[PDB]
């Protein structure tokens, strides 16, 4: 991985040593060439995972996530380029640096071979992210969103640090391969029940699980565009990636300890989906859409079946590209009228016919139209959840109906009806804004033709 | 004060801890504690106004009373064993009275109420001395008798200090109090691990010193005592915001900064001894430190508070501070986690 | 070797430098009372350094290239706008007064640092001790609020006691009817709008507060205009003062040492004028504040510390 | 009230540069920034990255495992063996508790 | 749920509790007389604690 990491560490000197008129071109050119090199990880001709050293190693779970991270860096640079044009030079280079730093840590976070190394990297991402939301956010509420984001994570993460230390003080190591090949069944004593929650609540908060999710709609609604893109596409998947990795050493307590969290996800996802029907803020509607998709990911990981893992991995990558595409699209309006209210601007298909096509395709991905990989996830999670118990189809049936309503209601409200003709500042879509959407959508279409690449570990 | 006084007074301040640290006999260890107490007093009260006089008085009566209690332990022990050093056979109550007295000298809660006020009434550079160099002498005594210390007293003091330091610092708009409560909380970590691994108490002391030194130096750059005073740094020394923020996160124990290492290794070693409950509460209340450190970061580097007209003159002028030590201590106190295995052992 | 303890311990001591004319003289008086001429001939006759009255641009001309800065970098206040509209709700009046105190406070430190480092005396037209007369005039006429007066007295209380006072004070008493005439024959269109009730308040503060306050520490000389119109007469009055009161008697090498560390450190001099007390008159929002700060740092020779600006012809940067 | 800039106004990005691409206020820097994104983004990554992924062979043994299953399903059918045994590990090697 | 009871129970009550504690333990009168009086209580509790563990 040191050939994906070291060149990425060089985008930091390149950011600072480049000319004022070359920073945005140079960095965004080399970010693409770094996401090309990360494709080497996909050269997996065998059933043995790639182990590069004692530190890093790539699996079929950590490779899609690694690549999605590297590909997202150039996307976020282009997204952040028009709302930073009024800042002096050092602020732009300081913004570019915080985004690169978040790509370097995220790649190391998914490639780490030891839990303690995962934890530290998994905590370091708060710094660049807290700086982004707070320094470059727009409203006065960005200060309260940084606190909610920082201390939901930290409160959950202290018990995880405790539990990880107990694992090593007993097993001798935190290496993920060794803990896999030497795992011993846990007793059902009241101490291991707490060890289970200690190892899980950190990741269940980051998903977020229903109940403890109020940090996400606060963070999204106030972060700059690249703050929402990375949050909705990668940082939520730190929770999912962690739970998959550490749940191997927690058996058999997941057969009963998971009930409270399968129930909060299955019921919680209906509560969040139905919120999107009455949400007056467009950036808020998407953020609750994320909460209700991650609910299925939580539910499917808690049952540990080959299908459920397979559906969750596909839904992790699919949601990564889709939610990011939605946030970019909502930003495109926001960078014209500087209002997040969904009903303020209407009939935008009349003056942005092409941007209205991307809206439709993003919206169709969100409501999981076959054959997109958004459905494959939803469909394979449903299949596994049905086998787990047959009445989960009742709640997933409902959530599928609501998911259609708020997806199309989102499209019908903003793109149709009459134009809000007083908006004389609706400039034609930039070539930059359209490229940003094509870069989200083309990979999503390509991954549908080759789903094998995002089946995860079980398949 | 004239150069003769500084040479005499600053030498004596330095001399005290070196006598306590190099001494085999307990009475010579006590003597070094007296040198520090006596010689710091003129430094604290140099500006001579109503507040530094109260500060130098509260400090004297606290540290003199604690000295007498320590001396009683040293003397009851000479009665019991005819020797000038603590032995495995030293009475249990003799050791506990030494612990409470030394914690009274360190500022550990619940014997802590003096420290935030004294730090408040004195100039910044003497707060630096008081919150750093002055802690080594009492701590060096404690590390010499760690096989003997009752852990129940030590953990109740450490748990108290971590809680009171967190709660106290959460309510403060004065920077000097925020530094005192910061000190109280960190001493809780040094003390909690003392009877188990005294080497980790020295690691946590050293990392705290190199974080607390530049932080004071940063406030001494513009002589900024309040949260509103430090909020003007963007319009006074904006070059300082990058390293003030990291040092504050580093003082907060956030990864991947050097200040995570002390908490992380202390927790690790506490649970090697099965000190699960204490370790969990300690780490859970260290979260409160990060909140009011975060609030400071909000006011200085992540937002721009309103500035005043007269600050434009300040910009026309040229500063000769900080010195080369600030930069060296700022980098080492934040970017040295990848050297963790070389610091613990 | 910048002055410091090691410079003093090796020989750089003030008390050796002082001679009979190592004095601080301040020429005071009303508007157009002849301070400029009189202060300039006191200094020339006695071999003392003359410091022209500190104005809006005093600190622009002592730093950088010594050229006046755009008024946004130099206080964002206008004396002309004070005389055209003294009650404007843009806070000009107290912004002007608060800025003028700071610049005077800086000139005093510049003057004192010259005195203590060389032994040469200085003559200043007004100073930080007489500055308040203008503030009191503004408040009596309703040109500033009571809160502005509190904010002035606070800054003064935090900065004035740090410094030694003048050895001598040379007040020039000119009655208002004559003053008002001199302003009219001066020429400036704006300065001719000054109310005579404002001029009188400047004269009342001088005689009811300044002079009784200074006679307790300084030799005070009061000259009617005709006495002042011959500066040689005033200088012969200065050559024979005894100076037998005030703080300058109780000063030794090590009291001077710490005063010299104060006045050579201009950020330490100005420190308390910038306290975060939020009067709308002087408070600046981050947007305007940051715009100004950034524009200022793009000025020729202002981007880096003096001596590291390659634009203005600095050399050997890679070795400094 | 306090000294503060007024809010900057609503600018048209196309007013001065009708070919504005969205990247920079300077036309020449602006076009080359658009060109770079299209070249490294579409001509290089999407084209070659897609090609390199289509010719990764035997991905995760999806191809070898089929070729091997056909070999085993043949060998076992002619030799009369079961297509797939119920037990994975031979019962001989497993010493059960008594 | 989300806007009200989920705020009230977790983030809001946690901030209320800790603000409550930082208010109780920080409002000290600044009198050395009272501080030593508490230092006296501390000493007696350590004597008592050690006494019942002999």
């Amino acid at each position: 991985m040191l050939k994906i990491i070291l060149p990425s560490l060089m985008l930091l000197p390149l950011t600072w040593l480049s000319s004022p008129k070359k920073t945005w071109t140079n960095v965004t050119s080399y970010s693409f060439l770094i996401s090309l090199t990360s494709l080497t990880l996909l050269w997996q001709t065998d059933e043995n995972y790639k182990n590069f050293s004692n530190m890093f190693s790539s699996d079929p779970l950590s490779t899609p996530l690694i690549i999605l991270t590297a590909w997202l860096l150039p996307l976020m640079l282009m997204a952040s380029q028009n709302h930073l044009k009024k800042d002096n030079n050092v602020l732009q280079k300081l913004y570019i640096s915080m985004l690169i730093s978040l790509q370097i840590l995220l790649i190391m976070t998914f490639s780490a071979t030891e839990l303690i190394m995962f934890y530290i990297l998994f905590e370091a991402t708060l710094i660049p992210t807290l700086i982004i939301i707070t320094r470059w956010g727009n409203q006065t509420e960005r200060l309260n969103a940084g606190i909610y984001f920082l201390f939901y994570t930290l409160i959950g993460s202290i018990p995880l640090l405790i539990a990880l230390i107990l694992i090593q003080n007993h097993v001798g190591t935190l290496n993920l391969m060794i803990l896999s090949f030497t795992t011993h069944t846990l007793d059902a004593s009241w101490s291991n029940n707490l060890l289970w929650l200690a190892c899980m609540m950190a990741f269940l908060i980051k998903m977020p699980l229903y109940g403890v999710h109020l940090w996400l709609p606060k963070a999204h609604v106030e972060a700059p565009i690249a703050g929402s893109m990375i949050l909705a596409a990668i940082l939520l998947k730190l929770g999912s990636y962690g739970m998959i990795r550490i749940s191997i050493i927690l058996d058999p307590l997941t057969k009963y300890m998971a009930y409270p969290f399968i129930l909060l996800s299955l019921w919680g996802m209906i509560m969040t989906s139905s919120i999107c029907l009455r949400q007056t803020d467009l950036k808020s509607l998407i953020a609750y859409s994320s909460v209700s998709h991650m609910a299925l990911v939580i539910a499917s990981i808690m049952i540990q079946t080959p299908w459920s893992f397979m559906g969750a991995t596909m839904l992790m990558i699919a949601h990564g590209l889709t939610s990011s595409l939605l946030f970019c699209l909502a930003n495109s309006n926001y960078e014209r009228i500087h209002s997040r209210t969904m009903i303020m601007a209407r009939g935008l298909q009349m003056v942005f016919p092409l941007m209205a096509t991307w809206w439709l395709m993003a919206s169709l991905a969100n409501l999981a139209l076959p054959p997109s990989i958004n459905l494959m996830g939803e469909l394979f999670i449903t299949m596994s959840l049905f086998s787990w118990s047959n009445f989960t189809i009742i709640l997933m049936g409902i959530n599928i109906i609501i998911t259609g309503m708020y997806s199309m209601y989102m499209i019908i409200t903003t793109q149709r009806g009459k134009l809000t003709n007083h908006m004389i500042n609706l400039q034609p879509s930039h070539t930059r804004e359209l490229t940003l959407m094509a870069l989200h959508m083309i990979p999503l279409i390509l991954l549908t033709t080759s789903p094998k690449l995002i089946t995860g570990l079980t398949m | 004060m004239n150069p003769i006084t500084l040479a005499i007074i600053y030498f004596t301040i330095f001399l005290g801890p070196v006598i306590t640290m190099s001494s085999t006999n307990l009475m010579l260890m006590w003597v070094g504690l007296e040198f520090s107490l006596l010689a710091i007093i003129p430094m604290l009260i140099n500006k001579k106004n109503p507040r530094s006089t109260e500060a130098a008085t509260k400090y004297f009566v606290t540290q003199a009373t604690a000295s007498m209690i320590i001396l009683l332990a040293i003397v009851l022990n000479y009665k019991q064993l005819g020797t000038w050093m603590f032995q495995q056979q030293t009475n249990g109550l003799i050791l506990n009275m030494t612990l409470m007295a030394l914690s009274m000298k360190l500022g550990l809660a619940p014997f802590h109420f003096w420290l935030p006020e004294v730090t408040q009434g004195i100039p910044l550079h003497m707060g630096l001395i008081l919150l750093t160099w002055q802690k080594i002498a009492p701590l060096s005594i404690l590390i010499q008798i760690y096989p003997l210390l009752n852990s129940t007293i030590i953990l109740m003091l450490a748990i108290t200090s971590i809680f009171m330091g967190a709660w106290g610092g959460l309510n403060q708009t004065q920077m000097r109090k925020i530094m005192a409560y910061s000190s109280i909380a960190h001493m809780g970590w040094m003390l909690a691990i003392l009877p188990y691994n005294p080497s980790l108490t020295l690691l946590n002391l050293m990392i705290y010193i190199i974080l607390t030194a530049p932080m004071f130096m940063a406030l001494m750059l513009n002589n900024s005592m309040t949260i509103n005073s430090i909020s003007l740094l963007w319009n006074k020394t904006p070059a300082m915001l990058t390293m003030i923020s990291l040092m504050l996160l580093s003082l907060g124990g956030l990864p991947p900064l050097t200040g995570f290492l002390p908490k992380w290794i202390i927790i690790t070693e506490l649970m090697k001894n099965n000190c699960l409950i204490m370790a969990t509460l300690m780490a859970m209340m260290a979260l409160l430190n990060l909140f009011f450190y975060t609030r400071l970061i909000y006011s200085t580097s992540l937002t721009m508070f309103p500035t005043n007209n007269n600050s434009k003159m300040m910009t026309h002028q040229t500063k000769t501070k900080p010195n080369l030590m600030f930069s060296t201590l700022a980098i080492m106190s934040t970017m040295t986690l990848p050297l963790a295995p070389q610091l613990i052992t | 070797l910048r002055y410091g303890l090691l410079a003093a311990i090796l020989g750089d001591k003030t008390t050796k430098k002082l001679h009979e004319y190592s004095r601080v003289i301040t020429v005071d008086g009303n508007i157009c009372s002849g301070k400029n001429k009189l202060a300039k001939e006191i200094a020339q006759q006695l071999g003392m350094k003359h410091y022209p009255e500190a104005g809006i641009q005093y600190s622009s001309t002592t730093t950088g290239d010594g050229r006046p800065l755009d008024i946004e970098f130099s206080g964002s206040c206008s004396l002309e706008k004070f005389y055209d509209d003294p009650k404007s709700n843009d806070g000009n009046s107290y912004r002007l007064q608060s800025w003028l105190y700071a610049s005077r406070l800086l000139q005093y430190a510049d003057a004192l640092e010259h005195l203590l480092s060389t032994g040469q005396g200085v003559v200043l037209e007004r100073s930080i001790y007489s500055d308040f007369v203008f503030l009191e005039a503004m408040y009596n006429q309703g040109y500033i609020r009571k809160q502005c007066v509190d904010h002035y007295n606070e800054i003064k209380r935090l900065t004035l006691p740090e410094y030694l006072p003048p050895h001598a004070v040379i007040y020039i008493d000119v009655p208002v009817p004559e003053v008002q005439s001199r302003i009219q024959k001066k020429g400036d269109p704006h300065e001719m709008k000054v109310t005579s009730a404002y001029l009188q308040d400047i004269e009342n503060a001088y005689k009811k507060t300044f002079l009784p306050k200074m006679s307790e520490m300084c030799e005070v000389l009061v000259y009617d205009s005709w006495e002042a119109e011959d500066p040689t007469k005033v200088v012969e009055d200065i050559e024979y003062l005894k100076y037998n009161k005030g703080p300058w008697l109780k000063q030794d090498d090590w009291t001077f040492h710490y005063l010299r560390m104060l006045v050579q450190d201009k950020t330490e001099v100005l420190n308390y004028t910038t306290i975060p007390v939020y009067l709308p008159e002087i408070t600046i929002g981050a947007h305007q504040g940051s715009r100004i700060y950034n524009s200022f740092r793009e000025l020729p020779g202002r981007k880096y510390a003096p001596g590291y600006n390659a634009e203005v012809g600095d050399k050997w940067i890679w070795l400094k | 009230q306090w000294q503060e800039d007024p809010e900057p106004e609503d600018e048209n990005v196309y007013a001065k540069n009708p070919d504005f691409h969205g990247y920079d206020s300077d036309p020449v820097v602006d076009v080359w920034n658009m060109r770079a994104v299209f070249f490294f983004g579409f001509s290089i990554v999407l084209v070659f990255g897609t090609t390199f992924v289509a010719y990764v062979p035997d991905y995760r043994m999806q191809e070898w495992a089929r070729r091997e299953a056909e070999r085993l399903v043949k060998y076992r059918e002619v030799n009369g063996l079961p297509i797939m045994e119920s037990n994975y590990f031979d019962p001989s090697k497993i010493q059960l508790p008594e | 749920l989300d806007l009200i009871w989920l705020e009230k129970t977790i983030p809001k009550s946690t901030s209320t509790l800790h603000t409550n504690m930082t208010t109780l333990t920080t409002n000290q009168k600044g009198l050395i007389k009272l501080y030593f009086m508490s230092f006296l209580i501390n000493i007696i509790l350590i004597i008592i604690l050690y006494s019942i563990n002999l």
Partner: peptide, 19 residues
């Protein structure tokens, strides 16, 4: 719109004796 940056009312909440 423009980025919100703290005003006089916001900063006056750190101006007291306690927080």
């Amino acid at each position: 719109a423009r980025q919100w940056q703290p005003d006089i009312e916001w900063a006056e909440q750190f101006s007291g004796a306690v927080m």
